[PDB]
Amino acid sequence: XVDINNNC
Amino acid sequence: RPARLDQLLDMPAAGLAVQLRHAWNPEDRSLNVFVKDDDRLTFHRHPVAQSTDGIRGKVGHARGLHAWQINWPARQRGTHAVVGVATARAPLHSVGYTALVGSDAESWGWDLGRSRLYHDGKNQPGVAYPAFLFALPDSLLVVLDMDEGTLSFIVDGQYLGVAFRGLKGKKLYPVVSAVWGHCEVTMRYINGLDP
């Protein structure tokens, strides 16, 4: 997970 | 600080029925959020990438002074955790991660992490808030004065001043916009005063 808004 | 603010706050807070009547609206939301089965005052945001999601309260305020508490765990805020008010026209969803509440003329919001106020945010720069400055705790109060046409906030018992002006004549609903996967935001209506 790359996503920084906990959307993975 | 208005005298009416303390009069509202120092009354015993509204009971469960009133809290429920003013809670998040399951009919007025981004499809990516849902009101929890075990707690009708809290929503849960599904973990959707590149999506900003909002929900309004059930009640649109036209007159009087109103306050509600937002409980938003600091670790569940992400890049844009915005708290405020909106007309019925404010979009409740955007693609990407944005300060959706406060993005156009239909909503006014305080972006919690940036400590910035947005209104017509697509065309207008954010405003530092509080004006005296600030790490935000999990809960805050939102004070909507539909008679003065103001939006204000109370953090840790401290009145932070007027955030927005020019709200009179509008029907304004509590609103938030969230970007964090699995975030849960609770809203509890405190009380209202007549004009």
PDB file of N, CA and C in Angstrom, chain B residues 8-95:
ATOM      1  N   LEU B   8     -26.488  28.263  25.917  1.00  0.00           N
ATOM      2  CA  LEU B   8     -26.769  27.034  25.185  1.00  0.00           C
ATOM      3  C   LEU B   8     -25.974  25.863  25.770  1.00  0.00           C
ATOM      4  N   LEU B   9     -24.646  26.048  25.954  1.00  0.00           N
ATOM      5  CA  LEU B   9     -23.712  25.021  26.424  1.00  0.00           C
ATOM      6  C   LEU B   9     -23.960  24.557  27.835  1.00  0.00           C
ATOM      7  N   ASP B  10     -24.416  25.460  28.731  1.00  0.00           N
ATOM      8  CA  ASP B  10     -24.584  25.119  30.139  1.00  0.00           C
ATOM      9  C   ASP B  10     -25.949  24.507  30.475  1.00  0.00           C
ATOM     10  N   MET B  11     -26.832  24.357  29.489  1.00  0.00           N
ATOM     11  CA  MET B  11     -28.074  23.610  29.661  1.00  0.00           C
ATOM     12  C   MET B  11     -27.649  22.112  29.603  1.00  0.00           C
ATOM     13  N   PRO B  12     -28.350  21.148  30.242  1.00  0.00           N
ATOM     14  CA  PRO B  12     -28.041  19.737  29.976  1.00  0.00           C
ATOM     15  C   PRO B  12     -28.188  19.452  28.477  1.00  0.00           C
ATOM     16  N   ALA B  13     -27.229  18.728  27.879  1.00  0.00           N
ATOM     17  CA  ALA B  13     -27.218  18.385  26.454  1.00  0.00           C
ATOM     18  C   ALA B  13     -28.447  17.584  26.087  1.00  0.00           C
ATOM     19  N   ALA B  14     -28.896  17.735  24.839  1.00  0.00           N
ATOM     20  CA  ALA B  14     -30.046  17.052  24.278  1.00  0.00           C
ATOM     21  C   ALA B  14     -29.988  15.540  24.467  1.00  0.00           C
ATOM     22  N   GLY B  15     -31.162  14.967  24.675  1.00  0.00           N
ATOM     23  CA  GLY B  15     -31.362  13.543  24.868  1.00  0.00           C
ATOM     24  C   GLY B  15     -31.247  12.756  23.585  1.00  0.00           C
ATOM     25  N   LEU B  16     -31.244  11.434  23.723  1.00  0.00           N
ATOM     26  CA  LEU B  16     -31.056  10.504  22.591  1.00  0.00           C
ATOM     27  C   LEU B  16     -31.961  10.761  21.406  1.00  0.00           C
ATOM     28  N   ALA B  17     -33.292  10.935  21.609  1.00  0.00           N
ATOM     29  CA  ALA B  17     -34.222  11.208  20.508  1.00  0.00           C
ATOM     30  C   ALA B  17     -33.787  12.416  19.663  1.00  0.00           C
ATOM     31  N   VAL B  18     -33.472  13.550  20.316  1.00  0.00           N
ATOM     32  CA  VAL B  18     -33.024  14.796  19.663  1.00  0.00           C
ATOM     33  C   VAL B  18     -31.686  14.562  18.931  1.00  0.00           C
ATOM     34  N   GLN B  19     -30.743  13.879  19.597  1.00  0.00           N
ATOM     35  CA  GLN B  19     -29.434  13.526  19.029  1.00  0.00           C
ATOM     36  C   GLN B  19     -29.626  12.739  17.711  1.00  0.00           C
ATOM     37  N   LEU B  20     -30.538  11.762  17.722  1.00  0.00           N
ATOM     38  CA  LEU B  20     -30.905  10.922  16.594  1.00  0.00           C
ATOM     39  C   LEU B  20     -31.577  11.718  15.477  1.00  0.00           C
ATOM     40  N   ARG B  21     -32.495  12.660  15.826  1.00  0.00           N
ATOM     41  CA  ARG B  21     -33.143  13.520  14.845  1.00  0.00           C
ATOM     42  C   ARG B  21     -32.157  14.444  14.130  1.00  0.00           C
ATOM     43  N   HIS B  22     -31.066  14.828  14.811  1.00  0.00           N
ATOM     44  CA  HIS B  22     -30.070  15.703  14.211  1.00  0.00           C
ATOM     45  C   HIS B  22     -28.814  14.952  13.745  1.00  0.00           C
ATOM     46  N   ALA B  23     -28.840  13.609  13.765  1.00  0.00           N
ATOM     47  CA  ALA B  23     -27.674  12.795  13.416  1.00  0.00           C
ATOM     48  C   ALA B  23     -27.435  12.742  11.902  1.00  0.00           C
ATOM     49  N   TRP B  24     -26.295  12.134  11.465  1.00  0.00           N
ATOM     50  CA  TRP B  24     -25.977  11.957  10.034  1.00  0.00           C
ATOM     51  C   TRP B  24     -27.170  11.374   9.320  1.00  0.00           C
ATOM     52  N   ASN B  25     -27.422  11.875   8.115  1.00  0.00           N
ATOM     53  CA  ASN B  25     -28.529  11.405   7.328  1.00  0.00           C
ATOM     54  C   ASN B  25     -28.126  10.219   6.422  1.00  0.00           C
ATOM     55  N   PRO B  26     -28.694   8.999   6.647  1.00  0.00           N
ATOM     56  CA  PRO B  26     -28.422   7.870   5.736  1.00  0.00           C
ATOM     57  C   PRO B  26     -28.936   8.125   4.294  1.00  0.00           C
ATOM     58  N   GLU B  27     -29.796   9.149   4.069  1.00  0.00           N
ATOM     59  CA  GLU B  27     -30.283   9.465   2.741  1.00  0.00           C
ATOM     60  C   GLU B  27     -29.464  10.556   2.049  1.00  0.00           C
ATOM     61  N   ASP B  28     -28.548  11.194   2.797  1.00  0.00           N
ATOM     62  CA  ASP B  28     -27.802  12.331   2.275  1.00  0.00           C
ATOM     63  C   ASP B  28     -26.342  12.164   2.495  1.00  0.00           C
ATOM     64  N   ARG B  29     -25.763  11.291   1.697  1.00  0.00           N
ATOM     65  CA  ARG B  29     -24.373  10.916   1.905  1.00  0.00           C
ATOM     66  C   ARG B  29     -23.683  10.489   0.644  1.00  0.00           C
ATOM     67  N   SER B  30     -22.353  10.456   0.694  1.00  0.00           N
ATOM     68  CA  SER B  30     -21.590   9.854  -0.379  1.00  0.00           C
ATOM     69  C   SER B  30     -21.955   8.355  -0.251  1.00  0.00           C
ATOM     70  N   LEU B  31     -21.993   7.607  -1.358  1.00  0.00           N
ATOM     71  CA  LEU B  31     -22.269   6.174  -1.286  1.00  0.00           C
ATOM     72  C   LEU B  31     -21.138   5.383  -0.623  1.00  0.00           C
ATOM     73  N   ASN B  32     -19.974   6.012  -0.411  1.00  0.00           N
ATOM     74  CA  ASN B  32     -18.810   5.389   0.203  1.00  0.00           C
ATOM     75  C   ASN B  32     -18.825   5.452   1.730  1.00  0.00           C
ATOM     76  N   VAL B  33     -19.796   6.193   2.327  1.00  0.00           N
ATOM     77  CA  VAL B  33     -19.916   6.233   3.783  1.00  0.00           C
ATOM     78  C   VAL B  33     -21.248   5.574   4.161  1.00  0.00           C
ATOM     79  N   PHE B  34     -21.343   5.087   5.401  1.00  0.00           N
ATOM     80  CA  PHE B  34     -22.574   4.495   5.920  1.00  0.00           C
ATOM     81  C   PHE B  34     -22.712   4.783   7.352  1.00  0.00           C
ATOM     82  N   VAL B  35     -23.967   4.926   7.793  1.00  0.00           N
ATOM     83  CA  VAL B  35     -24.238   5.164   9.225  1.00  0.00           C
ATOM     84  C   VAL B  35     -24.171   3.755   9.871  1.00  0.00           C
ATOM     85  N   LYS B  36     -23.383   3.640  10.924  1.00  0.00           N
ATOM     86  CA  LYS B  36     -23.154   2.364  11.623  1.00  0.00           C
ATOM     87  C   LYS B  36     -24.420   1.774  12.231  1.00  0.00           C
ATOM     88  N   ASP B  37     -24.598   0.449  12.088  1.00  0.00           N
ATOM     89  CA  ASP B  37     -25.778  -0.256  12.612  1.00  0.00           C
ATOM     90  C   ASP B  37     -25.843  -0.187  14.118  1.00  0.00           C
ATOM     91  N   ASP B  38     -24.681  -0.304  14.763  1.00  0.00           N
ATOM     92  CA  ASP B  38     -24.551  -0.296  16.221  1.00  0.00           C
ATOM     93  C   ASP B  38     -24.426   1.093  16.827  1.00  0.00           C
ATOM     94  N   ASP B  39     -24.359   2.149  15.995  1.00  0.00           N
ATOM     95  CA  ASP B  39     -24.237   3.521  16.483  1.00  0.00           C
ATOM     96  C   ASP B  39     -24.699   4.500  15.421  1.00  0.00           C
ATOM     97  N   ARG B  40     -25.960   4.908  15.511  1.00  0.00           N
ATOM     98  CA  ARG B  40     -26.602   5.807  14.547  1.00  0.00           C
ATOM     99  C   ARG B  40     -26.038   7.247  14.525  1.00  0.00           C
ATOM    100  N   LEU B  41     -25.126   7.604  15.428  1.00  0.00           N
ATOM    101  CA  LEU B  41     -24.533   8.940  15.435  1.00  0.00           C
ATOM    102  C   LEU B  41     -23.201   8.966  14.688  1.00  0.00           C
ATOM    103  N   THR B  42     -22.730   7.807  14.219  1.00  0.00           N
ATOM    104  CA  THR B  42     -21.409   7.685  13.611  1.00  0.00           C
ATOM    105  C   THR B  42     -21.475   7.085  12.240  1.00  0.00           C
ATOM    106  N   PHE B  43     -20.640   7.615  11.333  1.00  0.00           N
ATOM    107  CA  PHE B  43     -20.513   7.020  10.019  1.00  0.00           C
ATOM    108  C   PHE B  43     -19.167   6.341   9.897  1.00  0.00           C
ATOM    109  N   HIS B  44     -19.042   5.452   8.891  1.00  0.00           N
ATOM    110  CA  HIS B  44     -17.814   4.736   8.601  1.00  0.00           C
ATOM    111  C   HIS B  44     -17.530   4.926   7.129  1.00  0.00           C
ATOM    112  N   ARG B  45     -16.291   5.324   6.790  1.00  0.00           N
ATOM    113  CA  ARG B  45     -15.939   5.527   5.385  1.00  0.00           C
ATOM    114  C   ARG B  45     -15.259   4.305   4.835  1.00  0.00           C
ATOM    115  N   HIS B  46     -15.797   3.758   3.739  1.00  0.00           N
ATOM    116  CA  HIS B  46     -15.171   2.612   3.083  1.00  0.00           C
ATOM    117  C   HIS B  46     -13.810   3.030   2.546  1.00  0.00           C
ATOM    118  N   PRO B  47     -12.814   2.116   2.536  1.00  0.00           N
ATOM    119  CA  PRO B  47     -11.486   2.475   2.010  1.00  0.00           C
ATOM    120  C   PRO B  47     -11.401   2.496   0.465  1.00  0.00           C
ATOM    121  N   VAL B  48     -11.870   3.598  -0.120  1.00  0.00           N
ATOM    122  CA  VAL B  48     -11.875   3.877  -1.551  1.00  0.00           C
ATOM    123  C   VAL B  48     -10.706   4.798  -1.873  1.00  0.00           C
ATOM    124  N   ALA B  49      -9.810   4.374  -2.818  1.00  0.00           N
ATOM    125  CA  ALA B  49      -8.656   5.212  -3.187  1.00  0.00           C
ATOM    126  C   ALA B  49      -9.124   6.418  -4.002  1.00  0.00           C
ATOM    127  N   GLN B  50      -8.390   7.555  -3.891  1.00  0.00           N
ATOM    128  CA  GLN B  50      -8.642   8.761  -4.691  1.00  0.00           C
ATOM    129  C   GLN B  50     -10.113   9.208  -4.690  1.00  0.00           C
ATOM    130  N   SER B  51     -10.707   9.223  -3.493  1.00  0.00           N
ATOM    131  CA  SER B  51     -12.105   9.569  -3.262  1.00  0.00           C
ATOM    132  C   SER B  51     -12.225  10.423  -1.979  1.00  0.00           C
ATOM    133  N   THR B  52     -12.996  11.515  -2.067  1.00  0.00           N
ATOM    134  CA  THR B  52     -13.298  12.391  -0.915  1.00  0.00           C
ATOM    135  C   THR B  52     -14.798  12.240  -0.722  1.00  0.00           C
ATOM    136  N   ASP B  53     -15.223  12.006   0.525  1.00  0.00           N
ATOM    137  CA  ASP B  53     -16.596  11.656   0.828  1.00  0.00           C
ATOM    138  C   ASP B  53     -17.195  12.409   1.969  1.00  0.00           C
ATOM    139  N   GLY B  54     -18.427  12.865   1.768  1.00  0.00           N
ATOM    140  CA  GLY B  54     -19.175  13.652   2.732  1.00  0.00           C
ATOM    141  C   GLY B  54     -20.551  13.106   3.052  1.00  0.00           C
ATOM    142  N   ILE B  55     -21.145  13.683   4.071  1.00  0.00           N
ATOM    143  CA  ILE B  55     -22.469  13.332   4.588  1.00  0.00           C
ATOM    144  C   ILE B  55     -22.995  14.549   5.345  1.00  0.00           C
ATOM    145  N   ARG B  56     -24.271  14.829   5.188  1.00  0.00           N
ATOM    146  CA  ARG B  56     -24.841  15.952   5.933  1.00  0.00           C
ATOM    147  C   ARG B  56     -25.672  15.383   7.070  1.00  0.00           C
ATOM    148  N   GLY B  57     -25.949  16.207   8.058  1.00  0.00           N
ATOM    149  CA  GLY B  57     -26.855  15.863   9.139  1.00  0.00           C
ATOM    150  C   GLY B  57     -28.275  15.861   8.608  1.00  0.00           C
ATOM    151  N   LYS B  58     -29.226  15.329   9.388  1.00  0.00           N
ATOM    152  CA  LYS B  58     -30.634  15.315   8.939  1.00  0.00           C
ATOM    153  C   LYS B  58     -31.302  16.682   8.953  1.00  0.00           C
ATOM    154  N   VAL B  59     -30.882  17.558   9.836  1.00  0.00           N
ATOM    155  CA  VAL B  59     -31.535  18.850  10.028  1.00  0.00           C
ATOM    156  C   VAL B  59     -30.782  20.017   9.402  1.00  0.00           C
ATOM    157  N   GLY B  60     -31.507  20.785   8.568  1.00  0.00           N
ATOM    158  CA  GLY B  60     -31.023  22.027   7.986  1.00  0.00           C
ATOM    159  C   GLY B  60     -31.495  23.189   8.842  1.00  0.00           C
ATOM    160  N   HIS B  61     -30.560  23.932   9.419  1.00  0.00           N
ATOM    161  CA  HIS B  61     -30.851  25.088  10.294  1.00  0.00           C
ATOM    162  C   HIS B  61     -31.034  26.396   9.542  1.00  0.00           C
ATOM    163  N   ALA B  62     -32.124  27.074   9.839  1.00  0.00           N
ATOM    164  CA  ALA B  62     -32.519  28.333   9.199  1.00  0.00           C
ATOM    165  C   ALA B  62     -32.464  29.534  10.131  1.00  0.00           C
ATOM    166  N   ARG B  63     -32.745  29.286  11.404  1.00  0.00           N
ATOM    167  CA  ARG B  63     -32.755  30.299  12.441  1.00  0.00           C
ATOM    168  C   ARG B  63     -32.254  29.690  13.734  1.00  0.00           C
ATOM    169  N   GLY B  64     -31.841  30.551  14.654  1.00  0.00           N
ATOM    170  CA  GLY B  64     -31.381  30.211  16.001  1.00  0.00           C
ATOM    171  C   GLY B  64     -29.900  29.909  16.106  1.00  0.00           C
ATOM    172  N   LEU B  65     -29.465  29.498  17.300  1.00  0.00           N
ATOM    173  CA  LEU B  65     -28.090  29.148  17.637  1.00  0.00           C
ATOM    174  C   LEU B  65     -28.039  27.652  17.881  1.00  0.00           C
ATOM    175  N   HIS B  66     -27.030  26.977  17.315  1.00  0.00           N
ATOM    176  CA  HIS B  66     -26.975  25.525  17.421  1.00  0.00           C
ATOM    177  C   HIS B  66     -25.580  25.020  17.633  1.00  0.00           C
ATOM    178  N   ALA B  67     -25.456  23.949  18.403  1.00  0.00           N
ATOM    179  CA  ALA B  67     -24.132  23.397  18.555  1.00  0.00           C
ATOM    180  C   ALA B  67     -24.167  21.917  18.511  1.00  0.00           C
ATOM    181  N   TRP B  68     -23.106  21.324  17.977  1.00  0.00           N
ATOM    182  CA  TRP B  68     -22.958  19.862  17.957  1.00  0.00           C
ATOM    183  C   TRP B  68     -21.540  19.473  18.164  1.00  0.00           C
ATOM    184  N   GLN B  69     -21.310  18.264  18.673  1.00  0.00           N
ATOM    185  CA  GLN B  69     -19.954  17.796  18.915  1.00  0.00           C
ATOM    186  C   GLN B  69     -19.532  16.865  17.808  1.00  0.00           C
ATOM    187  N   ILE B  70     -18.308  17.046  17.295  1.00  0.00           N
ATOM    188  CA  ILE B  70     -17.745  16.115  16.301  1.00  0.00           C
ATOM    189  C   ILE B  70     -16.651  15.318  17.048  1.00  0.00           C
ATOM    190  N   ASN B  71     -16.732  13.985  17.012  1.00  0.00           N
ATOM    191  CA  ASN B  71     -15.671  13.133  17.557  1.00  0.00           C
ATOM    192  C   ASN B  71     -15.010  12.477  16.353  1.00  0.00           C
ATOM    193  N   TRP B  72     -13.739  12.846  16.071  1.00  0.00           N
ATOM    194  CA  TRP B  72     -13.048  12.345  14.897  1.00  0.00           C
ATOM    195  C   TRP B  72     -11.643  11.943  15.334  1.00  0.00           C
ATOM    196  N   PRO B  73     -11.419  10.661  15.646  1.00  0.00           N
ATOM    197  CA  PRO B  73     -10.070  10.245  16.091  1.00  0.00           C
ATOM    198  C   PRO B  73      -8.963  10.791  15.182  1.00  0.00           C
ATOM    199  N   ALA B  74      -7.974  11.511  15.786  1.00  0.00           N
ATOM    200  CA  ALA B  74      -6.859  12.177  15.091  1.00  0.00           C
ATOM    201  C   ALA B  74      -6.136  11.264  14.109  1.00  0.00           C
ATOM    202  N   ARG B  75      -5.930   9.973  14.484  1.00  0.00           N
ATOM    203  CA  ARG B  75      -5.291   8.976  13.632  1.00  0.00           C
ATOM    204  C   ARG B  75      -6.117   8.550  12.404  1.00  0.00           C
ATOM    205  N   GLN B  76      -7.391   8.963  12.338  1.00  0.00           N
ATOM    206  CA  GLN B  76      -8.327   8.604  11.280  1.00  0.00           C
ATOM    207  C   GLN B  76      -8.684   9.810  10.411  1.00  0.00           C
ATOM    208  N   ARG B  77      -7.821  10.823  10.391  1.00  0.00           N
ATOM    209  CA  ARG B  77      -8.093  12.041   9.648  1.00  0.00           C
ATOM    210  C   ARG B  77      -7.472  12.119   8.275  1.00  0.00           C
ATOM    211  N   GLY B  78      -6.292  11.554   8.116  1.00  0.00           N
ATOM    212  CA  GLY B  78      -5.602  11.599   6.836  1.00  0.00           C
ATOM    213  C   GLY B  78      -5.270  13.014   6.413  1.00  0.00           C
ATOM    214  N   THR B  79      -5.185  13.227   5.106  1.00  0.00           N
ATOM    215  CA  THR B  79      -4.774  14.507   4.542  1.00  0.00           C
ATOM    216  C   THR B  79      -5.819  15.593   4.572  1.00  0.00           C
ATOM    217  N   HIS B  80      -7.120  15.239   4.576  1.00  0.00           N
ATOM    218  CA  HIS B  80      -8.197  16.231   4.574  1.00  0.00           C
ATOM    219  C   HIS B  80      -9.366  15.742   5.389  1.00  0.00           C
ATOM    220  N   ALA B  81      -9.482  16.287   6.581  1.00  0.00           N
ATOM    221  CA  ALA B  81     -10.550  16.037   7.537  1.00  0.00           C
ATOM    222  C   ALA B  81     -11.173  17.396   7.715  1.00  0.00           C
ATOM    223  N   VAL B  82     -12.317  17.654   7.077  1.00  0.00           N
ATOM    224  CA  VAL B  82     -12.963  18.965   7.100  1.00  0.00           C
ATOM    225  C   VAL B  82     -14.296  18.899   7.790  1.00  0.00           C
ATOM    226  N   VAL B  83     -14.492  19.804   8.716  1.00  0.00           N
ATOM    227  CA  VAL B  83     -15.701  19.936   9.522  1.00  0.00           C
ATOM    228  C   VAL B  83     -16.363  21.286   9.286  1.00  0.00           C
ATOM    229  N   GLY B  84     -17.676  21.293   9.095  1.00  0.00           N
ATOM    230  CA  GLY B  84     -18.349  22.555   8.898  1.00  0.00           C
ATOM    231  C   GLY B  84     -19.820  22.446   8.638  1.00  0.00           C
ATOM    232  N   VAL B  85     -20.285  23.312   7.751  1.00  0.00           N
ATOM    233  CA  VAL B  85     -21.698  23.384   7.349  1.00  0.00           C
ATOM    234  C   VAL B  85     -21.865  23.495   5.872  1.00  0.00           C
ATOM    235  N   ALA B  86     -23.060  23.104   5.356  1.00  0.00           N
ATOM    236  CA  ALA B  86     -23.279  23.175   3.939  1.00  0.00           C
ATOM    237  C   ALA B  86     -24.730  23.394   3.623  1.00  0.00           C
ATOM    238  N   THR B  87     -25.004  23.955   2.460  1.00  0.00           N
ATOM    239  CA  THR B  87     -26.375  24.048   1.940  1.00  0.00           C
ATOM    240  C   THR B  87     -26.662  22.633   1.410  1.00  0.00           C
ATOM    241  N   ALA B  88     -27.902  22.387   0.965  1.00  0.00           N
ATOM    242  CA  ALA B  88     -28.327  21.138   0.334  1.00  0.00           C
ATOM    243  C   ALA B  88     -27.688  20.935  -1.060  1.00  0.00           C
ATOM    244  N   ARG B  89     -27.047  21.972  -1.611  1.00  0.00           N
ATOM    245  CA  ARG B  89     -26.425  21.951  -2.940  1.00  0.00           C
ATOM    246  C   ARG B  89     -24.960  21.522  -2.945  1.00  0.00           C
ATOM    247  N   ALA B  90     -24.336  21.499  -1.777  1.00  0.00           N
ATOM    248  CA  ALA B  90     -22.937  21.135  -1.664  1.00  0.00           C
ATOM    249  C   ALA B  90     -22.685  19.704  -2.114  1.00  0.00           C
ATOM    250  N   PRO B  91     -21.728  19.477  -3.040  1.00  0.00           N
ATOM    251  CA  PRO B  91     -21.455  18.098  -3.470  1.00  0.00           C
ATOM    252  C   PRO B  91     -20.898  17.295  -2.304  1.00  0.00           C
ATOM    253  N   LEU B  92     -21.370  16.037  -2.156  1.00  0.00           N
ATOM    254  CA  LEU B  92     -20.944  15.140  -1.072  1.00  0.00           C
ATOM    255  C   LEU B  92     -19.904  14.136  -1.508  1.00  0.00           C
ATOM    256  N   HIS B  93     -19.374  14.280  -2.744  1.00  0.00           N
ATOM    257  CA  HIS B  93     -18.310  13.400  -3.231  1.00  0.00           C
ATOM    258  C   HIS B  93     -17.426  14.101  -4.258  1.00  0.00           C
ATOM    259  N   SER B  94     -16.117  13.810  -4.223  1.00  0.00           N
ATOM    260  CA  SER B  94     -15.167  14.248  -5.228  1.00  0.00           C
ATOM    261  C   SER B  94     -14.158  13.120  -5.467  1.00  0.00           C
ATOM    262  N   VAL B  95     -13.515  13.154  -6.612  1.00  0.00           N
ATOM    263  CA  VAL B  95     -12.463  12.202  -6.909  1.00  0.00           C
ATOM    264  C   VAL B  95     -11.213  12.901  -6.388  1.00  0.00           C
TER     265      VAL B  95
END
